[PDB]
Design a protein around this ligand. Structure first.
Ligand SMILES: O=c1[nH]c(-c2cccc(S(=O)(=O)NC3CCCC3)c2)cs1
Length: 125
């Protein structure tokens, strides 16, 4: 298939954790970013069949999206906030990698990344 399986949202071999920072990342950061006018392309894994992007997964080897991140947070999949933040950063970077400077989708990622950074600048203790 053109589409690989989506990234795991559970892994019984991996330990779970809940922290105040992870709770914040779900309740405030993700759930607020989700409502942004530019969030829609990033709310689910890229579907290469739907979007007619047969090269997407030929180029992007560590796919990530906010749907996956949300499920991971809901599952307590992450050990800590930094692990979650790394997934957001992978999502943004993938967008810059797959596309070109100035592309509409890149302008969307750039705006979301700024909002994301604003929100994670300060996390709860
Ligand atoms: O690099 C990435 N592109 C996307 C994406 C997902 C759904 C739609 C779009 S888009 O802005 O509507 N571009 C269309 C995608 C195929 C041709 C145009 C981008 C998520 S991550």
């Amino acid at each position: 298939s053109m589409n690989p399986p989506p990234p795991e949202t559970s892994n019984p071999n991996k330990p779970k954790r809940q922290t105040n920072q992870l709770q914040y990342l779900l309740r405030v950061v993700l759930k607020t970013l989700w409502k942004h006018q530019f969030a829609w392309p990033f709310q689910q894994p890229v579907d290469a069949v739907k979007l007619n992007l047969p090269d997407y997964y030929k180029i992007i080897k560590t796919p990530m999206d906010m749907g996956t991140i949300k499920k991971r947070l809901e599952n307590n999949y992450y050990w800590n906030a930094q692990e979650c933040i790394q997934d957001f950063n992978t999502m943004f970077t993938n967008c810059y990698i797959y596309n070109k400077p100035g592309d509409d989708i890149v302008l969307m990622a750039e705006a979301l990344e700024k909002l994301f950074l604003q929100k994670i600048n300060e996390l709860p203790t």
